[PDB]
Amino acid sequence: AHIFVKPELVAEIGVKQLQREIVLPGLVWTNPLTDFGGSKNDTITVRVPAITTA
C-alpha cells in the first residue's frame, strides 16, 4: 500500500498541569524579626512582659 513519510507535530493548545492558587503566604505574620545575623544561634529571643496579681 501507499506509505508516506511525515513529521511528528507538537503543539501547545494551552493545556497544562492544574496547580494550587497561592493564598497562605500573604496571611501569616511575616518578618517581625530581621537581625537574625548578629545573634547567638540565630535566635532573637522575644520577651513577653510580666503581669502580677493583687
Add this chain to the structure above:
Amino acid sequence: GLISDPVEVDPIQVGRDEAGWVQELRDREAWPKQEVPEQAKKPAKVGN
C-alpha cells in the same frame, strides 16, 4: 495487486492503533453504567 481487489489494511491505521490514542468511551445505552475503558485511563507519555 489488482485495482479491483479489496482495499488493503491501511498502515497508518496500524500505527495509529499501535500508538493507542484513539478515544474509547462508555456506551450510552448500557445499564448499569459500564466501567471505564483501559485506554481512557492511559497516563501521559513522558516524551516523544
